[PDB]
Design an enzyme around this catalytic site. Structure first.
Site, PDB file in Angstrom:
ATOM      1  N   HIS A  61      71.933  34.869 -53.060  1.00 30.24           N
ATOM      2  CA  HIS A  61      73.146  35.229 -53.803  1.00 30.24           C
ATOM      3  C   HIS A  61      73.718  34.006 -54.518  1.00 30.24           C
ATOM      4  CE1 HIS A  61      73.016  37.554 -49.915  1.00 30.24           C
ATOM      5  NE2 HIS A  61      72.833  38.514 -50.804  1.00 30.24           N
ATOM      6  N   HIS A  91      79.484  26.269 -52.204  1.00 30.27           N
ATOM      7  CA  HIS A  91      78.537  26.946 -53.082  1.00 30.27           C
ATOM      8  C   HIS A  91      79.269  27.238 -54.382  1.00 30.27           C
ATOM      9  CE1 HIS A  91      80.889  30.120 -51.074  1.00 30.27           C
ATOM     10  NE2 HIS A  91      80.843  30.680 -52.270  1.00 30.27           N
ATOM     11  N   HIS A  93      79.649  29.926 -58.086  1.00 31.67           N
ATOM     12  CA  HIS A  93      79.337  31.157 -58.810  1.00 31.67           C
ATOM     13  C   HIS A  93      79.254  30.782 -60.284  1.00 31.67           C
ATOM     14  CE1 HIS A  93      80.499  33.493 -55.212  1.00 31.67           C
ATOM     15  NE2 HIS A  93      81.359  32.504 -55.056  1.00 31.67           N
ATOM     16  N   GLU A 103      85.016  33.375 -60.682  1.00 36.02           N
ATOM     17  CA  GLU A 103      85.532  34.565 -60.000  1.00 36.02           C
ATOM     18  C   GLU A 103      87.032  34.757 -60.260  1.00 36.02           C
ATOM     19  OE1 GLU A 103      83.838  34.325 -55.882  1.00 36.02           O
ATOM     20  OE2 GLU A 103      82.509  35.866 -56.707  1.00 36.02           O
ATOM     21  N   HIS A 116      83.370  26.823 -54.532  1.00 38.30           N
ATOM     22  CA  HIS A 116      84.107  27.224 -53.333  1.00 38.30           C
ATOM     23  C   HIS A 116      83.742  26.325 -52.158  1.00 38.30           C
ATOM     24  CE1 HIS A 116      84.622  31.614 -54.952  1.00 38.30           C
ATOM     25  NE2 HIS A 116      85.511  30.780 -55.455  1.00 38.30           N
ATOM     26  N   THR A 195      84.737  36.673 -51.101  1.00 40.02           N
ATOM     27  CA  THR A 195      84.368  37.345 -52.363  1.00 40.02           C
ATOM     28  C   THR A 195      82.961  37.966 -52.346  1.00 40.02           C
ATOM     29  OG1 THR A 195      83.611  35.319 -53.509  1.00 40.02           O
ATOM     30  CG2 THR A 195      85.977  35.923 -53.743  1.00 40.02           C
ATOM     31  N   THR A 196      82.272  37.834 -51.216  1.00 36.78           N
ATOM     32  CA  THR A 196      81.010  38.524 -50.979  1.00 36.78           C
ATOM     33  C   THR A 196      81.147  39.375 -49.726  1.00 36.78           C
ATOM     34  OG1 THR A 196      80.255  36.540 -49.805  1.00 36.78           O
ATOM     35  CG2 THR A 196      79.480  36.849 -52.076  1.00 36.78           C
TER      36      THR A 196
HETATM   37  C1  LIG Z   1      85.254  32.690 -50.282  1.00 37.19           C
HETATM   38  O1  LIG Z   1      84.155  32.307 -49.518  1.00 37.19           O
HETATM   39  C2  LIG Z   1      83.431  33.176 -48.937  1.00 37.19           C
HETATM   40  O2  LIG Z   1      83.491  34.391 -49.255  1.00 37.19           O
HETATM   41  C3  LIG Z   1      82.422  32.722 -47.922  1.00 37.19           C
HETATM   42  C4  LIG Z   1      81.598  33.550 -47.476  1.00 37.19           C
HETATM   43  C5  LIG Z   1      80.700  33.122 -46.510  1.00 37.19           C
HETATM   44  O3  LIG Z   1      80.798  32.003 -46.037  1.00 37.19           O
HETATM   45  N1  LIG Z   1      79.629  33.994 -46.096  1.00 37.19           N
HETATM   46  C6  LIG Z   1      78.523  33.539 -45.270  1.00 37.19           C
HETATM   47  C7  LIG Z   1      77.913  34.658 -44.432  1.00 37.19           C
HETATM   48  C8  LIG Z   1      78.716  35.167 -43.245  1.00 37.19           C
HETATM   49  C9  LIG Z   1      78.312  34.746 -41.844  1.00 37.19           C
HETATM   50  C10 LIG Z   1      79.068  35.231 -40.704  1.00 37.19           C
HETATM   51  C11 LIG Z   1      80.225  36.124 -40.894  1.00 37.19           C
HETATM   52  O4  LIG Z   1      80.912  36.565 -39.773  1.00 37.19           O
HETATM   53  C12 LIG Z   1      80.625  36.532 -42.247  1.00 37.19           C
HETATM   54 CL1  LIG Z   1      81.819  37.410 -42.401  1.00 37.19          CL
HETATM   55  C13 LIG Z   1      79.847  36.034 -43.443  1.00 37.19           C
HETATM   56  C14 LIG Z   1      77.507  32.722 -46.017  1.00 37.19           C
HETATM   57  O5  LIG Z   1      77.429  32.758 -47.238  1.00 37.19           O
HETATM   58  O6  LIG Z   1      76.685  31.861 -45.330  1.00 37.19           O
HETATM   59 ZN   LIG Z   2      82.207  31.876 -53.324  1.00 36.44          ZN
END
Ligand SMILES: COC(=O)/C=C/C(=O)N[C@@H](Cc1ccc(O)c(Cl)c1)C(=O)O
Ligand SMILES: [Zn+2]
Length: 257
Positions: A61, A91, A93, A103, A116, A195-196
């Site tokens: 992603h 990371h 976007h 975003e 972010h 946001t994901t």
């Molecule tokens: C604004 O920043 C964000 O939306 C950050 C998103 C994020 O850090 N998501 C994780 C996956 C993840 C892992 C365990 C969990 O309980 C959940 Cl809820 C998501 C990731 O990208 O590695």
């Molecule tokens: Zn993000």
């Protein structure tokens, strides 16, 4: 699963994740003339001098640079935050074109990209527990515009060839995230969400007023990454941004006039 295509993009997320239509979703448009200056907002404290980067990963992603968060080494404090938030990952976007990619938007203006920096509240012990709390995460968002090159970003750009496809990771030690900050720490802040998916409503957003400039050559290299895994048909990783969601019953505060 979920993604950014016509058939699985943000328009579809609510089906697996009904919170997509919830009370405090992100991102949002930041209307600069409706944000309330709040003189009681303390200065932001960004303490990244002992930051320990570990690894860079293409998760299908975006790409994440991950940090050792087993101690208070790189933390966010102050501003609207109570307590200490540890940096876990950052990371970006970005768009298929320089005219889109961010975003959050500022008076409806889309930036070429958005960074972010994700931190979690140490009071909750780990990231997994933090995301279940309304004040579990603090995310520092920085806009990218295309102009002169950002030297502190080049180490990231250079390693992207080695993580081109979903699931690929590479060693990424001794990276200093301070090289990604603009001069000013003036900010807007509001309560929001990931946001994901799973789009959890656990985020205190801190969005910097001042964008950083990166070169067209730098963002071009972001666009060479792939959503797909190795050996699968190639889909370019571009336009991996969720569009602005309704503000609803929320207020955006500004740290500045
Ligand atoms: C604004 O920043 C964000 O939306 C950050 C998103 C994020 O850090 N998501 C994780 C996956 C993840 C892992 C365990 C969990 O309980 C959940 Cl809820 C998501 C990731 O990208 O590695
Ligand atoms: Zn993000």
């Amino acid at each position: 699963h979920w993604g950014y295509g016509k058939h699985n993009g943000p328009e579809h997320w609510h089906k697996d994740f009904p919170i997509a239509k919830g009370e405090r979703q992100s991102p949002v448009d930041i209307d600069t003339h409706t944000a309330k200056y709040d003189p009681s907002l303390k200065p932001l404290s960004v303490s990244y001098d002992q930051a320990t980067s570990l690894r860079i990963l293409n998760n299908g992603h975006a790409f994440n640079v991950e940090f050792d968060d087993s101690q208070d080494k790189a933390v966010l404090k102050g501003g609207p935050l109570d307590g200490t938030y540890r940096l876990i990952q950052f990371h970006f976007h970005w768009g298929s074109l320089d005219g889109q990619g961010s975003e959050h938007t500022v008076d409806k203006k889309k930036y070429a990209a958005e960074l972010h920096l994700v931190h979690w509240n140490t009071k909750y012990g780990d990231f997994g527990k933090a995301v279940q709390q309304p004040d579990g995460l603090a995310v520092l968002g920085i806009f990218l515009k295309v102009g002169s090159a950002k030297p502190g970003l080049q180490k990231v750009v250079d390693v992207l060839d080695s993580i081109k496809t979903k699931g690929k990771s590479a060693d990424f030690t001794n990276f200093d995230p301070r090289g990604l900050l603009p001069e000013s720490l003036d900010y807007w802040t509001y309560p929001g969400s990931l946001t994901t998916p799973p789009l959890l409503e656990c985020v205190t957003w801190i969005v910097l007023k001042e964008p950083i400039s990166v070169s067209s050559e730098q963002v071009l290299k972001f666009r060479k990454l792939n959503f797909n895994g190795e050996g699968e048909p190639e889909e370019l990783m571009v336009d991996n941004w969720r569009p602005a969601q309704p503000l609803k019953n929320r207020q955006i505060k500004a740290s500045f006039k």
